[PDB]
Chain A
């Protein structure tokens, strides 16, 4: 029975799971693009949201500094996270880290996904664009909207 409980187990326990999530977070901060199973990328995004929030809260804070030093095992990523990814989202709150699903892997055929931050100097992934506002259904909806607006 696991009602209302998340925390998907991956490694041999909580410590191994946290270590794997920290490694994934470091890789995502470095390369800004990682393909991994859906649960792993979901947890990575969930932790990266709070990481970006804490990095945006301030730099001189000792709590955020200790958290960045703990969750980043490369040291050099801390100044980058504090001076690039923090001033970038100064106008956004919690709207970032877009998740996209890929088919399968050519090894064990496992469900994977790729996530990335907004902006991104790398070319954007092919986003599932919706239908244009010129199809029959869209034109009929626009006509009905204009009719109800002129009738009001």
Chain B
């Protein structure tokens, strides 16, 4: 299991690919636990540098583990149209880009042609994980107890 961390260091974007299960990892510390409107922040490479820029010596904020994990509903702008990928396509499903101050109405109208309304109701392609989740939860509980 791996994860990529995005951060700008002296006007330069650095992306490290750590591993959740690696013998070289010392300790994993969470600075600010929060959610967003998207489960994949791969569109931060084409955004403004001030959004992906965070202080390296910031103090981690501590809170209770019962706030239902507050979600940060903050929109991020984008650089003109020299982007990396076509984020305007409906297959990515992104609700954190301001298309009003970056793209026009004709561009959205011509990009909505690749929309697949039948994919949302495919039914068979849905991965119903419930029994497997209960089984692995029982397993981890039995492993943690004794």
Contact indicator B124/A71 (Cβ below 8 Å)? no
Contact with A along B112-127 (1 / 0, CB 8 A): 0000101001111000
Contact indicator B124/A67 (Cβ below 8 Å)? no
A125 CA / B138 CA spacing, docked (Å): 45
Within 8 A of B (CB), among A25-69: 46-47, 50-51, 54, 66-67
Q: Which residues of B contact A71 (CB under 8 A)?
A: 121
State the main secondary structure of chain A at its contact with B: helix
Q: Which residues of B contact A18 (CB under 8 A)?
A: 118, 122
Contact indicator A50/B123 (Cβ below 8 Å)? yes
Contact indicator B118/A47 (Cβ below 8 Å)? no
A105 CA / B116 CA spacing, docked (Å): 35
A66 CA / B121 CA spacing, docked (Å): 9
Contact indicator B118/A67 (Cβ below 8 Å)? no
A70 CA / B118 CA spacing, docked (Å): 9
Contact with B along A129-143 (1 / 0, CB 8 A): 000000000000000
Within 8 A of A (CB), among B44-69: none
State the main secondary structure of chain B at its contact with A: loop
Contact with B along A92-110 (1 / 0, CB 8 A): 0000000000000000000
Q: Which residues of A contact B118 (CB under 8 A)?
A: 14-15, 18
Contact with A along B76-95 (1 / 0, CB 8 A): 00000000000000000000
Contact indicator B121/A50 (Cβ below 8 Å)? no
Q: Which residues of B contact A67 (CB under 8 A)?
A: 121, 123
Q: Which residues of B contact A51 (CB under 8 A)?
A: 123
Q: How far is the CB of A54 from chain B (nearest CB, A)?
A: 8
Q: Which residues of B contact A70 (CB under 8 A)?
A: 121
What are 18 A-B contacts defined by CB distance under 8 Å?
A14-B116, A14-B118, A15-B116, A15-B118, A18-B118, A18-B122, A46-B124, A47-B123, A47-B124, A50-B123, A50-B124, A51-B123, A54-B123, A66-B121, A67-B121, A67-B123, A70-B121, A71-B121
Could you tell me which A residues sit within 8 Å of B by CB distance?
Answer: 14-15, 18, 46-47, 50-51, 54, 66-67, 70-71
List 9 other contacts, CB 8 Å, given A18-B122, A67-B121. A15-B118, A18-B118, A47-B123, A47-B124, A50-B123, A50-B124, A51-B123, A66-B121, A71-B121
